[PDB]
């Protein structure tokens, strides 16, 4: 298990240095700000407290932390002959700013900004590719591949596109490769199918993948062990923040949402079975029902609630997913486990998808979450719409545009709207391709990609107020 | 006049009751409650003292009383031999519950609410309809007919749908009979008295109250509005600021003169008083009065010359009681090039001069057509869904589709329940994809139209993002 | 010379100069000013106070108009009789001033936006608008070719001609409507321009002397008024600006040379030290003091230089016939004038509140004609009773059509009681889309935001 490099695109205790690095770059980073003003499930402008992206991720961060502390005191002595010796701190430092940057790729909107764009490409682009390379001419399967891979956004892509060559923060690879959830293409179409469902990189960065996979150590097509505990860490506190955050919107009462739980418990198991990893012994309605009685604290009833639940039962989860790790330690190694540690059909695997079942029938089908997610679908298209006039012009029109060079006044003001790491972006991948025989193809492929940066890169205020003002209204 | 009721499969007490409820279901209803949020001429939002269409609905509702008051004074023992025995409650309730609800149907913003909609689905329905019946199967001569009933909305077949259909508030069909002011359905080519969805419900109204013919109910709903349709604009008018006092009776003078000379004295009044005595005679009320100039001029105005109308109305039912009873009278009661069809006009021409054209009227007419057809434009995404698809969405069912589904959750469960239940109707029916999409458009026209002028901004606005 | 007094409704010289006061009263108090004062120059008026509109624009213009012909009889002194410009010396100012006074009542709001906002609409559906109207075959192809350039080419300067006199109605002079030819013309006002040639004595294609004096009044100040409004928006600082003027002027000269018309023989670098010297010296308005120091010393080589120009090429100007502007001719003190062009591209224009009204404005713009593009699907028929007032069966257009203003549809059915002529149809349509850039065209900034925002009802 000594899959870690210090090495940067551009002794152990001279990677912890490195590390350390990564993790005032992170922080630091553009990426993580723009959490803070993305809204997770209801909409910020109008909930005080909360959750966001950012405030999500850090609990996730806390979480896997607990995860890898509470892995390797499992461990123990063994550790050492799989390699995890002396790397308490570098597999803490990975799994804990992989969890912060989980969520830096997705676009404002939750998921419907990722369908907004699909859904406007799909529609839009086939047309528009045809402009720019007629049929016949130019290279059919690197056509087929850009289409589908523009078609298919996905966040984690962008969030390795975003830490990678747009916010230039060359992290080791080590760090970076905890974004490779999924490790399909998007060029592959969707089929091993769940290592390779979803997207996980572009072809933007293929070659940066090339490299990872050589430098970090991997097979194509795998995954890396710190994806596994991070992706454990979001099953984990997947919902139990939004739930919190429903009881005190006022969705639900926290007496009925005990009851709401056995009943939605009810398809998983029983709930007077013993739940696994409790010195005490508690069942899942004992624990729901020794949450509710701590509460009636005579300050924060609805806050005690969900601490006393969280202590029982926070604690059987990352015990479960340590034991899970340790299990396939020579699969994980690989790459080759093929599900989530957490889905498995166990007692601790309810609690999870119970939390998920709970969520779905009362959180997310609140009018207030659904009219934010049909609200962003507008901006994300008509910004696509109203940023639409950059793609029709002719790969000349444009690079001279996004030289600065006086073209078009119309499209010159758009160009003069997009960010400049966006246009140099384009600028600097296009000076790479600018000698190949191809670069019809790969220019348009890059125009696109600059023009899916900037609308997944903005908040929720961020997009919103610049279709208002393209509006004019 | 019937009493029976759509759920009822099987006395004068007996038939009045039965009608206490009609009006206690229809006061009650949420038809009613809408048309109080919905502007008749000046807009709501800027105005606060105007009539809207609820009040509106309840000024004609006493001048459809009057008429039977005067209907019965004037026949008085005469009614024996028409056969109007025992009918002061029952023909009183039906004229003031027809009144109330007489305008339920038609869409927010006036009358572009509705052109809004027939001009949606003239322009881009055939194209969608094309989609879901593919040419060949199916009946033409259906889809012909079909497709000028979605392209010919009116509110008053609405009416007819809502109250049955929607609102499922199981009205007697003789109060719903008030509703069929006009005759011609909507598959044959003014306006239509009924949809296509409602011919069942037609055939059994006409059935147990000729088809084709008006109720007699309708006539004094018809002369009802008539005589309030404007009068109530115009004092708005004076408030908005529009006209004076002084300056209205020379309008109501000038425009009367050429129907009718001012000068000639108008039948019904004790007094003989003439268009311009009457009007000099309310003006001279006004001036003399110290607090309230304009209130004291339209109610002496009403006084004096709302009585005449209500005669001359009544009068003309009972000289056509026969084919008023029959139904086969082609004009309204009050339109006979006499003197108080030149008072009707009068007001109604005052109005056109000055009020309708108004730019806070016309600019919100105009606003309401931009938001109706956006509306239309916004939903229409569930149109372009097969009918397979959508009946998943209908029906809860997770449909891959989640923007359609997101639009689906917005709809009224009324409005959905109401589409499923008439698939229900035609479910293995051998040519159900014309009527799926047919009752697909049937819904989306009960969601806009059944919008307040608010509701429908707000959804608009909403769905805009902006 | 070049100068009578004869209106549209050798000659007394002092009934000239009553009847060119008379103009003065009239566009003074004309609307096509008024609007002036609501449509911004550079920075979105709604967003900043104090900004130059167009209208504060077209005063300082006036002002260096007459400077220019103030200057320059005094040049010509007593080889001005010579000429024909002997006691023309008011009627010539009083004609450049209110020239310069509406050289911008023509152009639409938000710029060049306005005008590229609706060259770019009609571009796009024009053709298929006007097809329907006249299907192919019949129509003259000559007059149809030519109707589609016109209507696809909206200028300001055109639209200034035709506003004052078809759509205002105010019947000035033909001299006065005169500078208003820099370049040019719609096809509504060859008819027009042609009396106005022949009652002035020009043969076609040429200019008038007020226009290459105008011309220069507005190159002078065209942007060294807008550059004062960054530095009071902080978009530039005083010193910072005097170093990018010099480094921007050494370009096109050297800034040590001496600039012709200074008495005390400054160059660009001392006359900028100059005006930098008396700011921060001078201890309430420093920013006002930079400029007027600067435009003292700056302003008075500028008129020298286009009035001098003007009788070197007195001959062809009063031929109409120079083909190049009073100031461009490579000199010092057309570096003058383009450094300050360069300035302001680099650091005014550019700036993202501009931009953001830029396209803003070409959204509403283009948005206003779709909205009233249902009236241009009409049929001739239909349309003409509208414009009339009759009521013909269309429910929304004619709640569009009563939008529109009198004086544009009062001008139409004007316009249609000339031309039965076999070619109506061809001329009722052409007019039909003059009208629509008429009401377009004329909106001030806020009064086109306020039509866009009411029709989209949100
Ligand atoms: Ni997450
Ligand atoms: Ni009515
Ligand atoms: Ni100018």
Known sequence: KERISRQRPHDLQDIVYQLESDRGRIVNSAAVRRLQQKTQVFPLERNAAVRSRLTHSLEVQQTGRFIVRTLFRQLGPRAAEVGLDGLEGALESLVEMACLMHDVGNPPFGHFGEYAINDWFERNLDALFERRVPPGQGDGLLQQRMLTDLKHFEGNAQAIRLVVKLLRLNLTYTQTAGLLKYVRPAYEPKPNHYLNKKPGFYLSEEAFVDELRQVLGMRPGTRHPVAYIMEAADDISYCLADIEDS???????????????????????????????????????????????????????????????????????????????????????????????????????????????????????????????????????????????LLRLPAEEFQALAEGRQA?????????????????????????????????????????????????????????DEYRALSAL
Not at 303 to 309: A, D, M, N
Not at 333 to 353: C, N
Not at 425 to 444: H, I, S
Request: overall charge negative; hydrophobic content about 40%.
């Open 247 to 389: 009881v005190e919107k006022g969705i639900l009462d926290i007496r009925q949402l005990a009851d709401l739980l056995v009943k939605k418990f009810a398809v998983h198991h029983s709930p007077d079975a013993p739940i696994p990893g409790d010195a005490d012994n508690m069942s899942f309605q004992r624990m729901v029902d020794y949450s509710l009685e701590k509460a009636e604290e005579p300050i924060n009833k609805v806050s005690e609630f969900f601490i006393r639940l969280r202590v029982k039962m926070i604690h059987p989860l990352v015990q479960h997913a340590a034991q899970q790790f340790i299990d396939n330690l020579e699969a994980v190694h690989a790459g080759t486990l093929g599900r989530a540690l957490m889905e498995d059909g166990s007692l601790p695997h309810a609690i999870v998808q119970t939390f998920k079942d709970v969520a779905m029938e009362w959180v997310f089908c609140h009018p207030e979450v659904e009219t934010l997610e049909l609200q962003g679908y507008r901006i994300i298209q008509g910004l696509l719409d109203f940023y639409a006039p």
């Open 408 to 464: 078009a006044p119309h499209p010159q003001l758009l160009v003069r709207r997009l960010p400049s790491q966006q246009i140099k972006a384009y600028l600097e991948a296009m000076k790479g391709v600018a000698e190949d025989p191809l670069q019809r193809q790969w220019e348009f492929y890059h125009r696109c990609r600059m023009l899916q940066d900037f609308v997944s890169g903005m908040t929720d205020q961020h997009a919103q």
